[PDB]
Amino acid sequence: SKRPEDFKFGKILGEGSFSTVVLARELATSREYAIKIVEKRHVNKENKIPYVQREKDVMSRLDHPFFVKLYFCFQDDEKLYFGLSYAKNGELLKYIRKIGSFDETCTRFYTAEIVSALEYLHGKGIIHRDLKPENILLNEDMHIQITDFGTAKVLSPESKQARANSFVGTAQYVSPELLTEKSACKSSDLWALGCIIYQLVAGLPPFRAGNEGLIFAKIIKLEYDFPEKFFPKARDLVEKLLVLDATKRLGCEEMEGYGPLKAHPFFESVTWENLHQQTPPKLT
Numbered sequence: 348s349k350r351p352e353d354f355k356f357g358k359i360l361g362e363g364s365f366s367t368v369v370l371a372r373e374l375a376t377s378r379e380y381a382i383k384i385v386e387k388r389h390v391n392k393e394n395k396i397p398y399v400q401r402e403k404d405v406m407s408r409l410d411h412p413f414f415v416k417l418y419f420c421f422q423d424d425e426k427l428y429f430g431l432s433y434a435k436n437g438e439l440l441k442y443i444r445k446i447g448s449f450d451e452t453c454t455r456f457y458t459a460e461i462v463s464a465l466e467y468l469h470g471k472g473i474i475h476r477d478l479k480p481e482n483i484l485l486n487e488d489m490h491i492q493i494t495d496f497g498t499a500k501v502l503s504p505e506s507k508q509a510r511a512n513s514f515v516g517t518a519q520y521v522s523p524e525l526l527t528e529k530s531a532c533k534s535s536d537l538w539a540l541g542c543i544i545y546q547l548v549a550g551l552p553p554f555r556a557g558n559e560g561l562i563f564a565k566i567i568k569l570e571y572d573f574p575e576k577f578f579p580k581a582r583d584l585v586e587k588l589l590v591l592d593a594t595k596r597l598g599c600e601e602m603e604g605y606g607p608l609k610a611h612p613f614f615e616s617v618t619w620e621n622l623h624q625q626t627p628p629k630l631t
């Protein structure tokens with residue numbers, strides 16, 4: 348229903364091999380959107396149509412403050428256009444790099460937002476499979492906006508599906524079960540969460556190397572260490588997430604879900620109910 352001429356495009360916000368995200372203003376309303384533009388020729392010439400379809404279908408299911416929102420879709424002869432919420436403050440990763448690591452209050456706040464987001468996503472039967480700081484954006488108010496759903500999976504409720512078979516992810520955050528059993532589950536995202544918490548505190552993710560195979564070897568052996576100063580209750584939480592057996596990670600269905608995870612001592616001072624309306628702590 349909307350058309351390209353309905354917008355004025357400004358700066359490019361990001362580029363992929365077959366997508367470009369542009370900041371746009373809608374003329375009839377003056378609203379700002381990040382519009383993801385997919386060139387049909389390239390996605391066709393690379394057989395990536397399924398990735399585009401997956402991102403659309405998954406995002407259309409999401410209606411929660413901690414996720415990028417898909418507002419509209421349209422196309423023309425050359426391009427698909429997806430109108431998304433604009434996360435003005437960019438990637439969480441940028442802040443980890445700039446400040447080196449997060450203090451305890453900021454680690455707690457942003458970890459709690461990620462946990463709240465995963466609770467919602469997993470409650471909808473969706474696995475992200477590529478959770479990482481690059482994919483956790485920050486809005487103008489400094490709340491999280493999780494993105495990148497082309498490699499997410501909607502588990503079928505009709506078959507009570509628990510495992511997903513596509514090999515997707517990012518080496519530093521990929522779960523041991525995907526490497527060894529060749530499938531992922533919702534608890535695979537809790538493994539990524541453990542890696543992210545570790546990275547917020549220590550400044551680097553826990554399994555790291557200059558070659559992906561080396562990372563895989565350490566993941567499957569649970570070969571990592573904590574720096575000498577690491578907030579102790581955060582270390583305990585990481586140790587309860589970075590567990591090789593995906594049925595034994597705090598937050599997973601076999602461990603009775605998000606209640607016990609939200610009850611962890613690292614979160615004692617968190618008020619879970621209105622996180623998105625709280626003022627985030629300043630990052631410095």
Ligand SMILES: Nc1ncnc2c1ncn2[C@@H]1O[C@H](COP(=O)(O)OP(=O)(O)OP(=O)(O)O)[C@@H](O)[C@H]1O
Nearest residue numbers: 360361362363364366367368381431432433434495
């Ligand atoms: N909703 C948004 N608000 C602000 N910036 C965004 C938004 N969505 C994406 N970007 C920026 O655009 C860039 C590309 O995102 P896009 O979804 O086009 O591809 P990608 O998934 O990052 O690339 P690839 O598919 O190759 O992994 C990212 O660097 C991201 O920071």
